[PDB]
Design a protein around this nucleic acid. Sequence first.
RNA 1: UGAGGGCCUUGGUCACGGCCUUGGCUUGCUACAAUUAACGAUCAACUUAGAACUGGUACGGACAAGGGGAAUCUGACUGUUAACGAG
Length: 119
Amino acid sequence: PPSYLNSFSNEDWVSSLDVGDGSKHIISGSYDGIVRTWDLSGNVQKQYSGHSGPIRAVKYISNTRLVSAGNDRTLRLWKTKNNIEDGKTLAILEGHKAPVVSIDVSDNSRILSASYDNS
RNA sequence: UGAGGGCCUUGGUCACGGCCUUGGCUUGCUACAAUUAACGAUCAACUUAGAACUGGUACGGACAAGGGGAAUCUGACUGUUAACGAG
C-alpha cells in the first residue's frame, strides 16, 4: 500500500506540481503567485515571484529553466543560476486574454498552453 | 548610486542555433533648487426663444334721436325771480 512518507506545509493553497524527468526537487505553484522548489526535506531552495495572481500550472524545462502560468494571462519563463535562491524572469509570454491553467513541454523546445479563452 | 531592457564581447559546452559563465530607454532610493501647477495637455459635451400686427387715447374738423324762450295759476314741498311736474 502507498504509505505516508513525508508532508511539508505551504503558505496558501497549492495548485500545481512537477518533479521533472531526472531530479529530486519538487516544483509547486501556489495561489499567492510564488513558485517554490523543494529538496525532499521540506526546505525551499528557489523562489519565483513576479506573477500578479495565483499560479495554475508549473512545468520543468531544464535544470536552470522554468515555465509557469496563472490567473494573469501570461506565461513566464524563468532562469536560475547553477541559502534560498531568487530566480528571475527571462520572458513574459502574452496573448491569452483569459487565465492560463495548463502547460506542457516537448522535446523540440516547444510549449503548449491551455487557457479559459477557449483557445 | 542601485535595478530591469538594448547594442558588444570573452571561454567551456552540445549539430548559422541552443545551454552555463565573464567585464560597458523604463524605474527605485538619496542630495540642491520650484512650490503664483494662480500653468499646460488630452478625452468628452454644445448650438440663434422668439411669436402676433390689436386697438383704445388725448388732439385738430362736420353728424349725432329734435322747433325754441319767459312769466303766472296750480300739485307734492329745500336751504332765491329757490328748485321739481314731459299739469
